[PDB]
Amino acid sequence: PHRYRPGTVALREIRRYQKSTELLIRKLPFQRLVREIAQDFKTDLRFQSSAVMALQEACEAYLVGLFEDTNLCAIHAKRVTIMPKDIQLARRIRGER
Amino acid sequence: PHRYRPGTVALREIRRYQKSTELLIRKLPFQRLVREIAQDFKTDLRFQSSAVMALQEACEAYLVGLFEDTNLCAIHAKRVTIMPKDIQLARRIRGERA
Amino acid sequence: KVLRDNIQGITKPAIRRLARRGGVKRISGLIYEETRGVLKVFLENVIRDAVTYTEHAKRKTVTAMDVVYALKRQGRTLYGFGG
Amino acid sequence: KVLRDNIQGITKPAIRRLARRGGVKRISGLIYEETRGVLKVFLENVIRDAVTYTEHAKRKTVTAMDVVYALKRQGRTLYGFGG
Amino acid sequence: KSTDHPKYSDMIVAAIQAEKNRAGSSRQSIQKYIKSHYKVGENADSQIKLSIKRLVTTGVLKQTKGVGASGSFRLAK
Amino acid sequence: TRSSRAGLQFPVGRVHRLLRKGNYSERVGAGAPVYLAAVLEYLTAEILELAGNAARDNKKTRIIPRHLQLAIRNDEELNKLLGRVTIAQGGVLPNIQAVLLPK
Amino acid sequence: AKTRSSRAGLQFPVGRVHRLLRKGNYSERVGAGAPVYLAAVLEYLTAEILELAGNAARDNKKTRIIPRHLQLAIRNDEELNKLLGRVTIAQGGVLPNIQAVLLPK
Amino acid sequence: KRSRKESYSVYVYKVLKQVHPDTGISSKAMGIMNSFVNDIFERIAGEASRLAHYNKRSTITSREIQTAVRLLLPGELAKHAVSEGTKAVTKYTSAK
Amino acid sequence: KRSRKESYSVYVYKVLKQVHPDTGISSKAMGIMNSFVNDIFERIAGEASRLAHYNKRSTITSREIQTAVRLLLPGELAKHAVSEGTKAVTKYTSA
DNA sequence: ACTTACGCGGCCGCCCTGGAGAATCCCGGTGCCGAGGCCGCTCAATTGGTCGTAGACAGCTCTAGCACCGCTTAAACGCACGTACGCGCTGTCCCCCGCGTTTTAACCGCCAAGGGGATTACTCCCTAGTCTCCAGGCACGTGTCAGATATATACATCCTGTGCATGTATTGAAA
DNA sequence: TTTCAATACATGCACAGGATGTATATATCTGACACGTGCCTGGAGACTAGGGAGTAATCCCCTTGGCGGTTAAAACGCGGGGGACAGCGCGTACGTGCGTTTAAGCGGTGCTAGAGCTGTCTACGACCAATTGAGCGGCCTCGGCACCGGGATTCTCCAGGGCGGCCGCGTAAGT
């Protein structure tokens, strides 16, 4: 057969995802999660697709920023693989706690 | 004589400075620095002591926060002594630096 | 009725693609659960305010204006909707 | 007249006491110069706005209200001066 | 003296005998001594590890390291 | 006075005048300042309770800004409400790192 | 000349801006010269942003402007990035950046 | 000559004496309290005006103030504040 | 019939045609431009009102707007904006 | 009859040539989105009056600001050495990569009706004005909490003395 | 004169004890800022006219929530092997700690005049209104652009064959 070293397809996929702007998280699970969380405040409520799209975009942007900060912290920590401690330090320095 | 290990007086002085609220930076050098920086925008200007005190307090608070963040980064970096790279990373994560 | 067994929607490949987009080469283990939790937290931090706006609008359907206002109050202005 | 040889006012013991208050045990070397520079930067970032307020007040003496407004616009509200 | 190039094992034995310590001659110091007292190249210097391994397997060099960490080596007499 | 009719200590007429003068709205009601002054008095009483507790714990008869800083930085609600606010003549909290202790 | 936009030589309306300033509950007495400065600055900034967007569109071999071009022009320029530092752009993405320590050697 | 200025010290003194009968205050703490009262004033007024402009109305009543208080404050403190407004308002309504 | 709504598309189209005669725009970009115009509106209006309240005045003139523009913008862009206001205002004053 | 002339012998490290799959450069025929034409009706335009906020001149006296003499204390020059930072090197187990297999996503077709949205009457609640008085505007003097401090006092930490397990030499016990 | 263990003995290691330089209230005293009192006043309070914003009842059809048949790409479970994560001996040089000597931070005193701050005159510019009308906004439309898809192409990354450094593999000539 043909064996590949770790990191060959990873860089290609990273360069791939840095060119398109389509959504990665599916709409139905996110909508069901939003409907579940909305029941914790008030029952019998209705939502629209625009609000779901806005929430999904905001969550994706925040997660991308957090992952970028975590990768920066992991690179500064003389390592490559990210760890939850890097995410904790990132959210501690950001002030969100 | 009597020799002391590194870190004996440091902790005591740290606990000392964490109890008083007096100023550490002198007023005359800070005032002269403010007067120097003010000449870069417009000449012939006058200032008061309240503005100098406010600037000194704000600068001390910002420096204390930056040093705390730098110490946290240095502790996370499996080290003890802080480095300028920790300050750079702190200001990068804060968003103040490009 | 409170719903459960829905936080597991954010599966492993979703977080893997998110890390690929963010620039991460390898992932650990507890991150999946932790990130998911934080996500839910942020979701609440928005949805609560949204519901409050709904209660201030005397309606039963959460429009997009309430979500836009809730996101703009948190210091994260999001365009592309134009009102 | 532009003044010089005044940035060296922030001496070594001052930054040492600041690091002791912040919780630092040992300091390096380039930090002194770097921190000093950043300090001057922030000073400008305030003083400029202060001078602008003075130019909007048609006066020659920078009062405390201008500095309070300049510090509050930057998102760093400082109390203790009630004005 | 330093005429023709002797065997790597002999050079390592000489470098060990040249240094004196209570814990033993560290391998890095031995490599530096061989690099400074011989005309060997980079690939020839890379043979020091395998030559030390062969000498330890034979029994000429005793190892007093910490759980196999390439600490130090001594000459058994 | 309306402050005696509502049972509060903060003035109502002054707050109503400030709300009508501050260029907020042309038509202002006569019941909103009651809610406003009540919430203000509640928050002020809570802050003063915390400050007095700190002063009694510090063996001091009067309240200093250090007590306010301690009460704000030790409590969760006041720290979350005043997260972007700097207190003059307050200082920091006495905290020592765990990895810096001798062993 | 009947409209003030033609008298001032601008494209943005002056009467609408004046009405919005007088109805937004900002001040009881509003001047008649401030909307001129306002509309002029608005038109200047809009023209600069449109110039940058058109440059990006011509560089991307596209005839029309998409939010991706706006995101690129904002994140590549220093002034627009400093002005819009706390703003998130929908359907924009991130900048193509690869870490240096992740490259093979 | 002189100019007349306003302050909020008598009310703070009355509240402190109602809470702690044997407790004083300084001048810097009084300035801090005045600045905090002014900050709360501006924040609540801006929130009320923003809600009034969003709801397309032109009258700031009680429900808008209650909503602004419940939005600016986290949760429990908001609820308590609501009660502090409600009871006193009822006492006012039974008066006049 | 439909309720009447307002927008800022004709002016953006005229500016784009004055700059790039062969360049179009979509709907999402138009919404982004409208949101940006509304944001600048609110920011400048709030700055002007805050300056008017600080200066103890009750009239928003030209100097307050110029000061707000110079304060909100960094430097060079502010200066350019000032010029863009000044020239057009002079042309208005001579009209 | 055994050691060094090296005869050859066989096993690890560095290079460039070599193949296959993924990224990259050109039409093809179709579609729905940017863009031009059209026509309706409310907000921008023209101009007279009356009014009160802003431009401008003048008298105070106050706080911004310049020269001076000692005084202890913070800043500064410089000997020593120990522990933290940094480079080198070994092992093992974990998350990278390819493959059999099953389930739930988007587009779609269609049936209901709810609370989103436009129309109107009439009314209780807010604005405007004259009159009028007591809460709160600030000068003043004094007096009680705590600033500065000298003499004992109990506690924290570096230095130094003391109990204990293993490899190996020498006089005794054994070949 | 040699075969084997005790033990006799000198190294790193765990625990109790001692000296000295620094944190910590404890009676005192003196000085200024906390706090109760007094007098003038302009902002707070009571009674009455007005109208249009605000509360509520009614009707229309736009659009969010339900569901059913259907194709398949993404979701899910197991294998094995290269190298990344983690523990460890060690080298020297860079920081603290405490020496000592010069300097500029800090405090009391005196004098001055620039411009912040208060009071006054009034006129240019702004608020409000009746009548006009043309620039701005909503529904049809079709057409020139890009979205989707089959095929050839040059770029970039992983794995394989040949050679040099010499060591024992073992023979002939030197001491």
Residue numbers in the entry:
A (entry chain E): 38 to 134
B (entry chain A): 38 to 135
C (entry chain F), D (entry chain B): 20 to 102
E (entry chain K): 1 to 77
F (entry chain G): 16 to 118
G (entry chain C): 14 to 118
H (entry chain H): 27 to 122
I (entry chain D): 27 to 121
How did the manuscript describe this experimental structure?
The nucleosome used in this study was reconstituted using the Widom 601 DNA sequence with 15 bp DNA extensions at both ends with bound linker histone to obtain a 177 bp chromatosome (details). The overall resolution of the density maps after 3D refinement was estimated at 4.5 Å. The local resolution map shows that the linker histone region exhibits a significantly lower resolution compared to the core histones indicating variability/flexibility of the bound linker histone or even its lower occupancy. The electron density corresponding to the H1 linker histone was found to be centred at the dyad axis. We noted a strong density in the minor groove of DNA at the dyad indicative of H1 interaction with the DNA minor groove at dyad. Furthermore, the EM density map had a more pronounced density along one of the linker arms compared to the other arm, indicating an interaction of the linker histone in that region. Additionally, the extra density along one of the linker arms suggests that the H1 interacts more distinctly in that region. Therefore, this model is neither a strict symmetric nor an asymmetric model of linker histone binding to the nucleosome but reveals an on-dyad binding with H1 tilted towards one-linker DNA arm. Based on these results we propose a structure of the human 177 bp chromatosome wherein the linker histone binds at the dyad axis of the nucleosome, in which it tends to interact with one of the linker arms in a tilted manner. Compared to the 177 bp nucleosome, the chromatosome displays less flexible linker DNA arms. In addition, the unwinding of the DNA is less pronounced in the chromatosome due to the linker DNA association with the bound linker histone, in agreement with the observation made in the Cryo-EM study of the 197 bp chromatosome.
To fit into the limited space of the nucleus, DNA is packed by wrapping around a histone octamer (HO) by 1.7 turns, forming the basic unit of chromatin, the nucleosome core particle (NCP). The linker histone protein has a globular domain and two unstructured tails. The linker histone binding to the NCP results in an increase of the DNA wrapping around the histone core from 1.7 to 1.9 turns and facilitates the formation of stem-like structures at the nucleosome entry-exit location. To further advance the understanding of the linker histone—nucleosome interaction mechanisms, here we studied in vitro reconstituted nucleosomes and chromatosomes using a 177 bp DNA template containing the Widom nucleosome positioning sequence, human histone octamers, and the human linker histones H1.0.
